[PDB]
Amino acid sequence: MALINPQFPYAGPVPIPGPAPTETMPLLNYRVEGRIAGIQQARQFMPFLQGPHREVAEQTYYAIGTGIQMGQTFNQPLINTQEG
Amino acid sequence: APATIAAGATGELTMYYWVPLAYSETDLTGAVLANVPQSKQRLKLEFAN
């Protein structure tokens, strides 16, 4: 967006020496076929386990029984003959 | 720069300055488009006396 100087104008570009025209043109680089080499193993001996863990520990229980329940020799009360 | 120039000696000393126009290498704020300009550019440089 330059302003044209009317007192000192200039013309378009003139030819100048050039950079040997084939040396600015590249070759198209020619890929050969390739292979991810080797026979891959199916599994890996991992350093960490792959499953979930638990944040807190919960107390577990198992039921037990008591035993054969016996009789008893109670201390027996007195007879309510109007004193009680 | 030599830290001390003795009497009758000469010291050689170099300094670099980066005069910035754009802000950084990835931020082009402040840069000057100069392909088809209006006139010449100027870089006024006053040196030590």
Side-chain angles (χ1 to χ4, degrees):
Chain A
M1 282 73 75
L3 297 163
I4 286 175
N5 200 334
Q7 209 185 11
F8 304 94
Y10 49 86
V14 296
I16 43 173
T22 47
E23 203 168 3
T24 67
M25 310 170 175
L27 293 190
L28 264 72
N29 259 337
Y30 204 80
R31 272 172 178 199
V32 310
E33 63 185 358
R35 160 166 267 175
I36 301 287
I39 305 166
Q40 286 157 30
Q41 61 199 51
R43 201 182 288 177
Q44 41 195 350
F45 206 85
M46 283 161 156
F48 307 109
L49 270 80
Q50 281 201 302
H53 310 260
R54 303 209 280 124
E55 321 176 16
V56 293
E58 198 189 41
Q59 171 77 64
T60 52
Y61 302 96
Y62 61 95
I64 61 175
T66 313
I68 306 179
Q69 283 165 341
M70 305 191 299
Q72 275 146 337
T73 64
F74 297 96
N75 292 130
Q76 295 192 301
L78 303 184
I79 301 299
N80 194 0
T81 61
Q82 287 83 21
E83 296 219 280
Chain B
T4 286
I5 307 176
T10 306
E12 190 73 27
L13 50 92
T14 311
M15 183 65 197
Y16 278 79
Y17 297 90
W18 172 257
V19 178
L21 283 183
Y23 185 62
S24 58
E25 292 91 306
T26 76
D27 199 71
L28 282 192
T29 307
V32 171
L33 173 64
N35 265 332
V36 49
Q38 190 69 242
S39 162
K40 285 172 182 288
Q41 321 158 20
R42 282 190 280 154
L43 190 65
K44 179 73 63 178
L45 289 174
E46 314 197 9
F47 293 96
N49 310 88

